[PDB]
Ligand SMILES: O=C1N[C@@H]2[C@@H](O)[C@@H](O)[C@H](O)[C@@H](CO)N2C1=O
């Protein structure tokens with residue numbers, strides 16, 4: 061039988077080794093390219109904001125990598141400024157930087173990390189204020205407030221309430237919670253008679269710009285943040301809306317192909333199937349199904365992705381649901397499978413979820429390890445699988461934390477109170 065504590069130690073060792081590569085090759089920069097041993101920018105070309113450092117902080121603290129955590133916190137306090145004449149994508153900036161500063165604040169108690177999270181949220185608020193509906197524009201200039209691109213989508217208007225609602229709790233100012241909730245209510249009030257929303261929306265007209273309902277591309281984390289706002293804030297509207305939206309998806313989007321459960325895109329009014337693609341991103345939804353009281357359905361959905369892992373090694377970035385085969389050969393070093401394994405495991409503690417996640421971690425080690433860290437893949441169909449040259453910022457917050465939480469039973473987390481954002485930032489449950 062597997063020694064889960066020895067596996068947790070191995071995860072921690074690999075994470076510390078990756079951190080050392082970041083310090084050596086990419087210190088203060090947004091992402092490491094771990095094959096070349098170089099860095100790249102994420103938000104603003106040539107004006108890095110320490111993205112991967114910020115994304116790593118709560119993971120380092122949970123693992124007891126205290127010297128490394130403090131080195132990162134001290135860098136942020138000396139160096140990280142948002143008074144920058146450049147355009148930032150509102151969605152990415154909130155889930156990665158506001159959320160990463162909040163989880164590091166909650167772990168450490170350090171007021172400067174909260175001050176920086178709040179400064180950044182106030183710059184992002186200008187994107188919501190530029191719409192008469194309160195729907196955020198996709199980009200905002202961090203210094204001047206000027207906005208660009210109102211042709212947005214459910215994920216990019218509806219993935220704010222966890223971070224903004226925690227800011228409201230800590231600061232006492234309800235304006236953040238209210239701004240985030242108003243944008244979600246807009247699209248919920250425009251549900252069709254069958255209970256679905258199209259995934260594409262215009263921030264100035266307030267109207268849908270497509271007819272496609274989705275659980276993945278353009279939409280994923282909207283549905284997650286409805287449940288999460290009930291769990292974090294006790295919001296009764298969000299509890300109702302979470303269950304309503306998922307029951308509409310199970311009635312009109314759930315379809316079986318070759319005996320396996322999938323959720324293709326459909327016309328939001330008629331329910332006709334409008335696409336045959338499913339993203340790897342959709343695997344999050346197996347865990348959301350369990351959280352909202354649909355665990356049998358969640359397990360059935362997880363099984364579709366378990367099939368893909370057993371057949372292809374690495375889950376394909378996109379599949380055709382009619383054949384079960386890849387639509388793309390590259391990957392993004394994606395975290396959604398161990399996300400779902402952790403969320404289902406928190407319900408019943410079944411060791412099956414540990415065995416499935418251990419396969420996923422061992423496959424990551426066999427395919428993505430490079431000279432100075434872990435990289436996304438070029439082609440999952442060759443042997444060996446060929447590599448690209450990038451460690452995405454979300455790797456530092458997500459799958460190494462998921463594996464460690466599944467295997468370590470760490471005393472630094474109250475597992476009964478644990479709450480994670482869509483970027484895996486811990487927003488409740490630290491034990492100091
Ligand atoms: O479209 C995306 N959705 C998810 C996000 O919810 C978050 O998990 C990561 O930024 C990242 C992990 O794959 N994601 C995306 O690129």
Ligand SMILES: [Ca+2]
Nearest residue numbers: 281344482483
């Ligand atoms: Ca996510």
Ligand SMILES: [Ca+2]
Nearest residue numbers: 284480481482
């Ligand atoms: Ca979640």
Ligand code: NA
Nearest residue numbers: 115118160457
């Ligand atoms: Na983080």
